[PDB]
């Protein structure tokens, strides 16, 4: 209860720091979600060392969005 | 009578009304007033307020909190800290020949040009406020640095609060 | 080569160029790179050239 | 959920929608007990009792 | 929580502030500003006349300084020494270096948990007082130790 | 003698602390990506060219808004005593914009409204006829 | 050709006078018309007379006035200081100097324009300073009762007025600081009709 | 209704008419018709003699009018300033603009919930009375705020 | 007498940091939008402006959703102007709409040409009282 | 065990190591209730329950 | 050079030495891992990782 009213206390700042609509592309599509990785090292077993510098992953593919999302779906 | 806006930049006179209400022992009021307006007592009152002072030999330094003595996110001034401002003027009246340097400092977050602009604006406002009491303009020089050096660390929340400051140095010769 | 205004009076203009070429330039006169000069205004810092451009203060 | 109103739906995303000649709006989507609208540039919430 | 420490061991901020009060009333200057701290000591109460040797009564004061330094957690401690103009420049440089080296060695011999000790002397290159009447009794002749409190 | 440090205020909250330390990294990421965008493509012109200022455009306003655009610019035109024009088809997807500013000029407010709109819509102003028009994006 | 002092109700007119320095003193209605490229370091006139000089290339000069003179000077003057105590009227077209200190006591009417790195001006009473088109990097204005100031500060503006004093700027400073004591006033005085006029920004928006 | 609110926050029409009666006894004029409400304030209790500077006593009246504007719900409020002719047109136009600007900034700093606040001052181009004997003492110098209550 | 601070003062240091972070991200997003925004020039923008004929000054109400030819025939009939066609209609003709209560014919046709975009345009001649509907090849 | 921190694990050995662009480190390894790191040149231990 | 994924760990604890000998001890502890260069005319101290694997 305390954290919910404290979250509600600063409503405009959440919208200020999170705006999906500025990142919404012109055909009403959410940009896809990615992840990065720098200086990866895997030791699978003996006699085998795998080393990579950078790597990237598409987590979620892009899709249509009727309306832009909000912080209330993620932090409330 | 008194004006909370800086007494219209007029010379304050507390001891006259102090000895008036003491007569209503005028000499008792006078010795009480020279006790109260003394350097030790005004330093004690400025330490009751949130103002830091350090004397180290001859160079003397004054530290003002931006977040409490300023209007927020602006070069505008906080207004309620006018008794602390009057105490600042009364203390700095005692050094009528010292050369003055004034500087501003902020935290780590934002554009470097933005921090430099904000610190320069705050330092220039402090310079103009000190000049507004009639001090000669060649006696002072203002500079607003960004996050070049801070007395605390910016990773800690309270230390990053401590990082922004107003610094007033003055020599003796 | 661009030029800029430094001092402006009603009637006469004081202009120094980008490389430091000074000019006590009259309203009826010839200017290099722009032909002649058409208009001089003091309340707004705008000088009209005969080549068809407005030259102002720097920024 | 089928909702007839004159406001602008914000939170859950609607699946289909229509507008009148009056400009009043009809939205169709799934169910949720909460709703979000922008009334006059100001955000407001709505409770769906009886869901 | 019963098996976890409530505080850092050997810590009492009341003792810290009262011994800092004792230090300032003994005139050894302690500067607290932000997370950074400075301690300045006059050399006339510590060493001989232009000499890198110690009076025996100074060891109690040095023990008190080390005991105060026990109360904090640190990373690096910087030691500088300063003097007045006596004969040359190099003479004062080496005297300040020797004095700072000796006090750094004794502070390391005492068990204060520091990772890095830096030490140097500067002679009389940077005064802190324009009034330079005195010799070894001048306030510019001094020894400074600086650090920043880590968390 | 008591010893104080001049930052002293009301007590904070840990969730506020966590939000601030997340948001500073978010803002730093936005700053570096804006630097990358500026260095990878140069600016060309300014929207002050298509929308210049004029007289009676300086009656200032402090504005908070988090909704659609049509009634907002209608209020702007009614305050400005200007003719208002709507051009193009309103899209099925509503365009929602947020503005929080204090005592600015109306032309600059229109310009930042245009910038927040982006490719969805544009604003043109003809002060000789005192007409402000909002044109939609003829797309899809 | 080193000195010229005139007194006693005469008119002196000359042209094409080249000099490194001459000591000029004017009194008792010296009607002076000069049309030469004069380089000089010191000039003095009492007042109650007109003087029109075209062409001055001076590395340094200093003028003190006591009467009520009317002076117009063409050329380029690297000026230092000015003090006015009567009913003076002065106009200088171009001045490329660095630091100026101006004191005005009774009545002054000065027409100045040029480049100034640092300027300070004190006004006491019934004193006018129309320093429009005079660009100052640092501007300091201190005005007592019944003072008129029109400034053109570009970067850093500092202004204080006691009572019934009008200070009007004509350029948007990067940094602005103004204060009024009893009835002072500091105003913007722009045109509202410029097609490329800038408004208040984040850093200079100090609300009066 | 046990969980749903019965009224808006801080609502009492007796207090509304009480502060209206007290304000009209003070001298500031409150106009009410249909949905539109106006408030006219003379410059004598607000500013000094033709200057955009606030006396210290004005802030109690500022807090009172902020308390009155806290009572209702509205979208857009507009403040218009009027004055007398003193030297020019530009001087009093800039003066009215500055006074309207600073009072709008203070009102927006205060927590009266409105989305848009327009601030303007026309100088002296729309007089109300031909009785122009006074200057700032003349009642044509004024500041009035207007809004329409929505729902 | 008494002056009060604003109610929503950022008294907390974390609130101050959050607010300036919001300021920074808003400014950064504004810079992103400014560097992204494509601006057509207001001079050589291809939009037929108001020709300002006296027949075009009338005000009317029109609701329509469909083709363009009979619509502009009605407009030319109301303006008492002749009308001509250049080009041919495609297989799929113009599908446009306009619904308004009080509008003048000049900006009605300007909105018509804006909805037309690129495949067709119009030209107005008030010297010889005609309107021409031009297709694209 | 999967561990995210900004510190440098020393003792128990890890199966894979991953790094961010902002001083953050992640490791995966076998299960252990105990760890040993170096914080700022000083070596420290770590106790983890719930295993 | 880039930081290798396997960290480079140095254990040195001595008392009251000059920094040049300190750096020489550090480079000897590194061995084939890294090298240390100092150019005092330009007042620049640099390290260099091993270009390997």
Residue numbers in the entry:
A (entry chain FC): 77 to 152
B (entry chain KL): 42 to 65, 88 to 236
C (entry chain Kf): 208 to 266
D (entry chain LH), J (entry chain KH): 311 to 361
E (entry chain JK), H (entry chain KK): 38 to 188
F (entry chain KD): 23 to 162
G (entry chain KM): 113 to 320
I (entry chain Kd): 24 to 160
Paper text:
Legionella pneumophila is an opportunistic pathogen that causes the potentially fatal pneumonia known as Legionnaires’ disease. The pathology associated with infection depends on bacterial delivery of effector proteins into the host via the membrane spanning Dot/Icm type IV secretion system (T4SS). The Dot/Icm complex of L. pneumophila is one of the largest known T4SSs. The Dot/Icm T4SS has as many as 300 protein substrates, a striking contrast to the H. pylori Cag and B. pertussis Ptl T4SSs, each of which transports only one virulence factor.
Using 3D variability analysis, we reconstructed a total of five maps that displayed differences in the way the outer membrane cap (OMC) and periplasmic ring (PR) were positioned. These maps led to the identification of an approximate 16-fold symmetry about the center of the dome positioned within the OMC. Within this dome there are 16 α-helices that appear nearly identical at this resolution. Indeed, a model of the C-terminal domain of DotG generated in Swiss Model using VirB10 as a template fits into the resolved dome density. However, we have unexpectedly uncovered that the Dot/Icm incorporates only 16 copies of DotG into the OMC dome out of the 18 DotG copies in the PR, giving rise to another symmetry mismatch within this system. Based on the structure of DotG modeled within the PR (residues 791–824) and the homology model fit into the dome density (consisting approximately of residues 857–1046), we hypothesize that DotG extends from the PR to the dome, though a physical connection between the two structures is not observed. (A) Two DotC were observed in the maps that were reconstructed during 3D variability analysis, one which contains an N-terminal extension (DotCLong) and one which does not (DotCshort). In contrast, the N-terminal extension of DotC was modeled as two relatively large helices positioned near DotG and bridging adjacent asymmetric units. Notably, this portion of DotC was only observed in either four or five of the 13 copies of DotC observed in each map. The movie shows that the OMC dome, OMC disk, and PR of Dot/Icm T4SS can accommodate various orientations in relation to each other that suggest that the complex could undergo a ratcheting motion, in which the dome and PR rotate back and forth about the central axis with the different regions of the complex tethered together by the physical connections across the symmetry mismatches.
